[PDB]
Amino acid sequence: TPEEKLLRAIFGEKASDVKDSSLRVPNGVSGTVIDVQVFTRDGVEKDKRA
Amino acid sequence: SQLKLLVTRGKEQGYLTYAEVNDHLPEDIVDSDQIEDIIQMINDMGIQVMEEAPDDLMLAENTADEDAAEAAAQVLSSVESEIGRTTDPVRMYMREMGTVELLTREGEIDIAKRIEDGINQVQCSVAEYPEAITYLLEQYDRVEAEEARLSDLITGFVDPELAREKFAELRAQYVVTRDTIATAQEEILKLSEVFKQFRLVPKQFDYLVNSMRVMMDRVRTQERLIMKLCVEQCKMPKKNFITLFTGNETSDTWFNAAIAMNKPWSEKLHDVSEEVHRALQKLQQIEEETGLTIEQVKDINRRMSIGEAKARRAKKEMVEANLRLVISIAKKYTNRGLQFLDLIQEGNIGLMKAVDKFEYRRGYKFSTYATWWIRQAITRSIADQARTIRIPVHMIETINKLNRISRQMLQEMGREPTPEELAERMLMPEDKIRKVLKIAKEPISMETPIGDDEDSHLGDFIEDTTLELPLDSATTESLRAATHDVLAGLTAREAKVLRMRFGIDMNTDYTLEEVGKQFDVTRERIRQIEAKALRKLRHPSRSEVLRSFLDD
Amino acid sequence: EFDAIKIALASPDMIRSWSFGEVKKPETINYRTFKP
Amino acid sequence: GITKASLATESFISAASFQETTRVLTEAAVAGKRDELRGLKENVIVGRLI
Amino acid sequence: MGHIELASPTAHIWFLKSLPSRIGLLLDMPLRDIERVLYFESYVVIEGGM
Amino acid sequence: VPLDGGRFATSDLNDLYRRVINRNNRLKRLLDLAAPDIIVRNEKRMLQEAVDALLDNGRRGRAITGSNKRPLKSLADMIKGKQGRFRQNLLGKRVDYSGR
Amino acid sequence: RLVIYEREAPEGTVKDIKEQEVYMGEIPLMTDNGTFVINGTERVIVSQLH
């Protein structure tokens, strides 16, 4: 927007090219993670947790 | 009429069952759609004809109660007096193709000869159009000069240099026919004879004949300008119009001698005299362009109309039996993406094309040459207008191939074929196979019922992802206020420079040069002012709320 | 704002005045790049 | 009756909300009716004050 | 909105199959007669004249 | 609207509108070729059916059905019916600033 | 097993004798406790009183 440019210039920020859509626990739920399972496609490379 | 008493019994019962609405129907109704229509008529005025007899649950009292009742009753009382389905567009087409006897056994060749002898009277009429011949001569001298490919004039003829020298001989005969303005009597005719041994490009011939029609229509437009402006506007007698104007049509002894005839119709033509005066000049000049008395070209084009009408009238009967054939073939392309009637209409268009492109000089079974065109047209249309998102034909072919190979592998491997293995079979990269797999699937219907007691649909659970969260709008307004405040707390020059540079509270922003020339300064000083302003705003104290808007 | 609702038949000229352009082809989207 | 008295309303926006919509719409259209919101159902559908 | 130029006229179904038959009432013609004329199974004279 | 996984979802009207354009276009094409009047009459009847299904599907002629085998909805069913815009006040209009 | 019953007599003598163990699909099996696993979720097929 025409103003956000001024603030960006002032503080010299760096707008990110990527926006986060991460799995976060539902509100009002508290508990202990007891199991994590990871399924990978046939082409993708398994990460260091799988 | 037991139908009336059926309606009364339904009123007295408060409902009708399917057995009741079957027992009291006319015993001569065979078509079901008439039964559907009459039950719909009954339901429109009441009472709903449910399929079973079904105490203490109140039913819809009399919702379908209105004057519409009696009128509806009349409709029912009129249904018995006559009969007819007319409720399935397929059935009417079937009946109409039944009417035309499917019996043209070697009469097809007779009608083909009729067409050949009907599309040649138009050729004869074209022959006496030296303007088209002049165009052909010009295009001969044009293509041989390599302004266009030589074959642009012929789709084959009845050798390059032989054709060029034959056209040169035509040029010689035409110059002798043209500079011999009672000596052009025989020459032109003879030149027409040798000219009748040619075969034009479809586009060339069609354009030339349409230009012939355009010229004759200009002549006929002048004929209107002389006719209705006088006969229908000035009340010039129809007999008088047939007498004087018709026969000369070019001289001044039929209009300028029409006002001077000293008749009640004559001396009233002064008011509309100007337009006829000008039409005489126009037609006299056009006769120079065409070099033919108006009546002659009128008659030749009338004969052309006769010939083309004869051709079309026989193509009708040619097309009908092959339409029966089209039904027969198209019966086996159902359930792909198109209703039956669209399939048969595409087939009929293809058949029209085939008949327009058939010759009776090859000893072919017409149930062979045409059926190919029919199937090709049907499959083309099915591939082009069967799905919401239009995937090109080659992708359709690849999808079909993939499905065939997948079925084969499943029957062979004994399980599902992995896309890696399927790409192993078909020499295609894995990514292409995955893409084509994704592409094919057709869209869902947003009115697909979901299993909820509220009886919702899949379209009611699709959130909108383009909206601006009402908190973002408030944040933007707060930012607009805060930037206004912070600008206020600066030197006037710095605030004005910043507003122009970044476009705050303004229309299109302006460049350094533009803002510099704005008040009065070079660009460098404007840059210095902007730098000073940004240095101040970067300084703390004045940089608390904005940094909060950052929230970093 | 407004103060009544009126309903009547729509003339061809009225319908042409509502519209912003004629819809000729039957094709919706481009199946590879989903622009209209 | 209470079921043949409600089918006499003079605001097709009201009458079209609980009766057969097609019939009410056609009858209103051919007759060129004007609906001047003076009921409670009408001003509810339109979003005004009852 | 958009508009489609129909090649040939077409009968607005609401004003035909409503069963007062608005077109029928206006023309003084039974519904079945206009049905025959529309579905191309007859001819209707618009000007007998002489 | 594009659903997840590359799969699309659409309302029935799209279908019907397509059904009314193809035929319409085809009709024009026939009139350009001066086709025999039997097929043009059949085409005109088809176009009439398409329009009558678009305005109100299933009113008279055995409503055309979609791939789902269900009878696809038309402009006269988005207004009418217990599930139309009208009668939405039967049970409708979720509301913000609320809880239970 | 496919047999073409060669077309002379008796009603075609048999000469072709094919014999292939073809695959006709999958039949879901019943867990030890009368429950089926259809898509990773246990299901129960209720009896019907017709």
Interacting residues of B186 by C-beta distance below 8 A, sequence separation 6+ = none
DSSP B243-267: IIIHHHSSSSSSSTTTGGG-STTGG
Q: What is the CATH number of the domain that holds D43?
A: 1.10.150.390
Measured between alpha carbons, how far is C30 from B436 in angstroms, rounded to an integer? 15
Burial class (CB in 10 A: 0-12, 13-18, 19+), B93: buried
User: Minimal CA–CA distance to B213: which of B142, B126, B120?
Assistant: B126
Query: Is the CB of F51 less than 8 angstroms away from the CB of E40?
Result: no
Q: Is B78 part of a structural domain of the chain? A: no
| Pairing assessment for the beta strands G36-37 and F9-10 based on DSSP bridges | unpaired
Known binding residues of B for Mg(2+): 544, 547
> Encoding tokens for residue F67?
């791939």
Q: Considering its fold, how many domains does chain D have in total? A: 1
Residue G44 tokens, joined:
């129960």
d(CA D29, CA B240): 55
Identify the helix (H) or strand (E) that includes residue B237: none
Chain breaks in chain B (C to N over 2.5 A) after: 54, 158, 181
Distance CA A27, CA A18 (A): 25
Indicate the number of domains in chain B: 4
Residue B185, token pair as written in the block:
């009597």
CB contact under 8 A, C20 and E1: yes
Report yes or no: B440 and C31 within 8 Å, Cβ to Cβ. Answer: no
Q: Are G35 and G42 in contact (CB under 8 A)?
A: yes
DSSP 3-state percent helix, strand, coil across chain A (nearest 5)? 15, 0, 85
Note whether B452 and B492 are same-domain residues.
no
Q: How far apart are the C-alpha atoms of F47 and F27, rounded to whole Å?
A: 8
- Which among E19, E39, E41 has CB closest to B75? E19
Question: How many Å lie between the alpha carbon of B538 and the closest alpha carbon of chain A?
Answer: 6
Q: Which residues contact B496 (CB under 8 A, 6 or more apart)?
A: B519
Give CA–CA dist B292/B188, Å, rounded.
Answer: 12
Sign, Cα dihedral of F79, F81, F86, F92:
negative
| CB–CB contact C23 E2 (8 Å) | yes
Give the whole-angstrom CA distance, residue B154 versus residue B168: 16
How near does any CA of chain E get to the CA of D24, in Å? 10
Helix, strand, coil distribution of chain E in percent, nearest 5: 35, 0, 65
Do the beta carbons of residue F79 and residue D21 sit within 8 Å?
Answer: yes
Is residue A4 packed enough to be buried (19+ CB in 10 Å), middle (13-18) or exposed (0-12)? middle
| Distant-in-sequence, close-in-space partners of B102: CB < 8 Å, separation ≥ 6 | B321, B324
Find, among F83, G6, F2, F60, the residue nearest to B40 by Cα. Answer: F60
Contact between residue F55 and residue F76 where contact means Cβ atoms under 8 Å apart: yes
Whether B252 and B376 map to the same domain: the answer is yes
Of B344, B359, B385, the residue at which a domain comes to its end is: B385
At B41, list the tokens. 């008529």
- CA separation (Å) from G44 to G28, G32, G38? 12, 13, 10
Q: Match 């039409």 to its residue by tokens.
A: B279
CA-to-CA dists, residue B416 to B405, B432, F7, G23, G25, angstroms: 11, 19, 22, 12, 11
- Token pair for B168: 């040169």
**Considering the domain boundaries, does residue B314 fall inside one?**
yes
The contacts of residue B129 (CB under 8 Å, 6+ apart) are B208, B212, B297, B300
Instruction: Work out the end-to-end distance of chain F between its first and last CA atoms, rounded to an integer number of angstroms.
Output: 32
Q: Which of B221, B322, B332, B235 is nearest to B279 (CA)?
A: B221
C-alpha closest to that of F53 among F68, F72, F40: F72
Residue with tokens 């079979």: B425
Phi then psi dihedrals of residue B419, to 5 deg: -55, -30
What is the Cα F94 distance to its own chain's centre?
A: 28
Residues B344 and B417 in one domain: no
Residues D22, E18 contacting (CB under 8 angstroms) = yes
CB A2 within 8 A of CB B502: yes
Residue B397, phi then psi, degrees to nearest 5? -60, -45
For residue A34, cis peptide bond before it (omega within 30 degrees of 0): no
Do B327 and B344 form a contact (C-beta atoms < 8 A)? Answer: yes
CATH at B27: 1.10.220.120
Give the angle D13-D16-D17 at the CA atoms, nearest 5°: 90
The count of C-alpha atoms lying within 13 angstroms of the C-alpha of A46, restricted to the half-sphere facing its C-beta, is 7
Query: DSSP character for B158?
Result: -
Judge if B410 and B480 occupy the same domain: no
Peptide bond into B540 cis (omega under 30): no
B285 and B230 both lie in a single domain: yes
Binding site residues of B, as ranges? 544, 547
Q: Quick check: B380 and B348 in contact, CB under 8 A?
A: no
Query: Quick one: B147 exposed, middle or buried, by C-beta within 10 A (0-12, 13-18, 19+)?
Result: exposed
∠ CA F34-F36-F40, nearest 5°, is 85
Q: Assess contact for B143 and B150: CB atoms under 8 A.
A: yes
Cβ distance of F12 and B447 shorter than 8 Å: yes
Residues B178 and B307 in one domain: yes
Residue where a domain terminates, one of B430, B448, B466: B466
Structure solved using which method?
cryo-EM
The residue among D14, D21, D43 with the most chain F CBs within 10 A of its CB, best to mutate, is D21
CA angle B187, B188, B190 (to 5 degrees): 65
DSSP string, B483-545: HHHHHHTS-HHHHHHHHHHHTTTSSS---HHHHHHHTT--HHHHHHHHHHHHHHHHSSSSSSH
Closest CA to B64 of D19, D8, D12, F86: D19
B160-B162-B164-B166 Cα dihedral, nearest 10 degrees: -150
Q: What is the DSSP letter of B296?
A: H
Among residues B385, B403, B429, the one where a domain terminates is B385
Chain CA centroid to CA D8, Å: 9
CA–CA separation, C35 vs D4, rounded Å? 53
The experimental resolution of this structure, in angstroms, equals: 3.1
Give a yes or no: residue B220 inside a domain: yes
Find the chain E residues whose C-beta atoms sit closer than 8 A to any C-beta of C: 1-5
Cβ-defined contact of E40 to F45 (cutoff 8 Å)? yes
Which tokens sit at C34? 């989903």
Write the secondary structure of B89-155 as one string of H (helix), E (strand) and C (coil): HHHHHHHHHHHCCCCCCCHHHHHHHHHHCCCCHHHHHHHCCHHHHHHHHHHHHHHCCCCCCHHHCEC
Structural contact between residues B387 and B439, judged by C-beta atoms closer than 8 angstroms: no
Report yes or no on B66 lying in a domain.
Answer: no
Cβ pair E4:F47 closer than 8 A:
no
| Phi-psi category of residue B86: left, alpha or beta, with phi > 0 → left and psi -120 to 50 → alpha | left
Name residue G36's beta-bridge partners.
G30, G43
Long-range residue pairs from B391-394, CB within 8 A, at least 24 positions apart, any chain: B391/B439, B391/B440, B391/C31
* 3-class DSSP state of C1: coil
Q: Does residue B124 lie in a domain region? A: yes
Same domain, B354 and B407: no
B410 and B391 fall within a common domain: yes
- Confirm whether B248 is domain-assigned: yes
Same domain, B261 and B338: yes
Asked if residues G31 and G42 have their Cβ atoms less than 8 Å apart, the reply is yes
CB F42 within 8 A of CB B93: yes
Same domain, yes or no, for B400 and B430?
A: yes
Query: Whole-angstrom Cα distance, residue C8 to residue D29?
Result: 4
Cα–Cα distance measured from residue B24 to residue B125, given in angstroms and rounded to the nearest whole number = 67
Q: Which structure tokens are listed for G25?
A: 């699909």
Residue reference for tokens 């030749």: B300
Find the CATH number of the domain harbouring B461.
Answer: 1.10.10.10
Q: What is the dihedral of CA B532, B534, B538, B542, to 10 degrees?
A: 90
Identify whether B431 is part of a domain.
yes
> Residue F41: phi, psi to the nearest 5?
-60, -45
Q: Which domain holds residue B456?
A: 386-466
On whether both B459 and B338 belong to a single domain, the answer is no
Query: B63 lies in a domain?
Result: no
Handedness of CA B316, B321, B327, B332 (dihedral sign): negative
Task: Compute how many other C-beta atoms are within 10 angstroms of the C-beta atom of residue B65.
Answer: 13
Q: Are residues B372 and B400 in the same domain?
A: no
- Name, in order, each residue with C-beta under 8 angstroms of B92's C-beta and a sequence gap of 6 or more: B86, E39, E40, E41, F42, F45
* Residues B139, B415: Cα–Cα separation, whole Å: 67
Chain B interface residues (partner F, CB cutoff 8 A): 33, 36-37, 40, 87-89, 92-93, 96-97, 100, 312, 315-316, 319-320, 323, 339, 341-342, 345, 348-349, 352, 385, 388-389, 438-439, 441-448, 454-455, 458-459, 462
- Which candidate from F21, F45, F51 shows the least CB-CB separation from E39? F45
CB B256 within 8 A of CB B262: no
Could you list the residue range(s) of the whole structural domain that residue D49 is in?
2-50
Q: What is the DSSP string of F25-90?
A: HHHHHHHHHT--HHHHHHHHHHHHHHHHHHHSTTSSS---B-TTSSB---HHHHHSSTTSSTTGGG
